[PDB]
Amino acid sequence: VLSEGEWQLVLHVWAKVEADVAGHGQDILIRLFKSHPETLEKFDRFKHLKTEAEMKASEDLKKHGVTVLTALGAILKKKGHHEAELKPLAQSHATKHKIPIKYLEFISEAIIHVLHSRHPGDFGADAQGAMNKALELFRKDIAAKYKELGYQG
């Protein structure tokens, strides 16, 4: 588990994201698509976008970013007690979108990257360490459901 003190750092950084969900969501999906171009092929919805400028201009992409971050906010707020919220996502990600586990590791890193970019001086080492743990917990739990269904990875 994460300690009560680590969960506090996590939820404290999350309050910063909640101040501007749409902006954070956009920077995160952009960062993921430019850094690991293979991820963009999984989205029939966004596969037409080519440059950073075009990505930035998509209202649909901004809308989807809010959706993703709201789902992840829900999860974090359960402080590890997130089975009901996590099972459905794993199932969809595994069996419908066909997303490999390693891509989840990629969006995790894009999340930490944005947080450093955006709040250079607030988001310190200790908070970074807490966030990392929280994201690994999420990945561990998903992978367990993926193995169950036979998509391990």
Q: Which residue has the tokens 């894009």?
A: 110
- Is 9 a binding residue for ligand HEM by CB under 6 A? The answer is no
Residue 56 CB contacts under 8 Å (≥ 6 apart), including other chains: 26, 30
- Is 107 a binding residue for ligand HEM by CB under 6 A? The answer is yes
Check the annotation: does 93 bind a ligand. yes
Taking CB under 6 A as the criterion, the residue among 56, 97, 102, 116 binding ligand HEM is 97
User: Which of 4, 6, 3, 16 is CA-nearest to residue 127?
Assistant: 6
Minimum Å gap between C-beta 121 and ligand HEM is: 25
Q: Is 121 helix (H, G, I), strand (E, B) or coil?
A: coil
CA-angle at 16, arms to 142 and 79, nearest 5°: 35
- Is 39 a binding residue for ligand HEM by CB under 6 A? The answer is yes
Binding to ligand HEM in span 48-77, by CB under 6 A: 67-68, 71-72
Q: Contact region for ligand HEM (CB under 6 A) — 1-9, 10-18, 96-104, 112-120? A: 96-104
- Classify residue 33 as exposed, middle or buried by CB count within 10 Å of its CB (0-12, 13-18, 19+): buried
Q: Contact region for ligand HEM (CB under 6 A) — 5-13, 97-105, 116-124, 125-133? A: 97-105
Per rule CB under 6 A, count of chain residues that contact ligand HEM: 16
CB 10, CB 77: distance < 8 Å: no
- Residues of this chain that bind ligand HEM (CB under 6 A): 39, 42-43, 45, 67-68, 71-72, 89, 92-93, 97, 99, 103-104, 107
